[PDB]
């Protein structure tokens, strides 16, 4: 209906974060290699410093988005039902999951 | 899906669940019927 | 008990035969297990 | 599987039983009166 197989949803994450990443570089148009040693075989590339601080960012952020919004979940879960009689949080929370079974 | 597992005998935890969590078809045979009838008519006969 | 009811018939007025009648047919308990019991009798009963 | 008796064999006994009791001219026991001359005996022992 319904649920979806762990590979669908990994490709829809992918595109997720494809539209936010084209999203960054509009708005940035808006504001406006290979080597390996010959002692060993470590391969070296050259990064710049910008977009991998904008990646880790990104990646930080988005982690406390998530967290935060399970956070308000958290918060009215318990809030919203207290209908039946409950000895603690746990409990209650354990018949919500009852709730979810029907 | 496999639903939650509650059982009357043992709740170690302490979970408080509803009582329709904790809480036959098939009638009589036509035996019956024609038992009781039988003890029925002839208890009349011998009486009578 | 359908024909104890009626061999007590003879025997003893309706009221006490109605009742014995009655009394066999309890719920039997042991632990868990719990049944009616809805045809033999029940020898403990001092009467039985 | 309803009961094994029959309307039948029922009949036959139920015929046995009320011709015996006339041959031996029986009278059903009568339900104790709410006055009785030996009742208080009886109880007596009942409760010992």
Known sequence: ??????DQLAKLSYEKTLRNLATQTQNSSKQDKVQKDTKTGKITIADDD???????????????????????????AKTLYGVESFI?????????KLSRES | K????????????????????????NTINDGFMKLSEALENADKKARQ | FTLLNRLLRL?????????????????????????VNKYGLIRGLKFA | NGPEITPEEATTIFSVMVEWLESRSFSPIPFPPLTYKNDTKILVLALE
């Not at chain 2, 059982?7 to 669940?17: A, Q």
């Open chain 3, 11 to 35: 025997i003893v007025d309706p009221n006490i035969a109605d009742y014995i009648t009655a009394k066999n047919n309890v719920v039997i308990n042991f632990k868990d297990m719990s049944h």
């Open chain 1, 1 to 6: 209906r319904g649920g979806i197989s762990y």
């Open chain 2, 2 to 25: 496999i639903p939650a597992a509650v059982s009357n005998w043992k709740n170690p935890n302490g979970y408080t669940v509803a009582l329709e969590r904790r809480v036959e078809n």
């Open chain 1, 50 to 76: 910008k977009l991998v601080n904008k990646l880790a960012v990104s990646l930080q952020s988005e982690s406390k988005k998530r967290y935060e919004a399970r956070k308000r979940q958290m918060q009215n």
């Open chain 1, 88 to 96: 603690n949080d746990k409990n209650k929370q354990f018949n919500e």
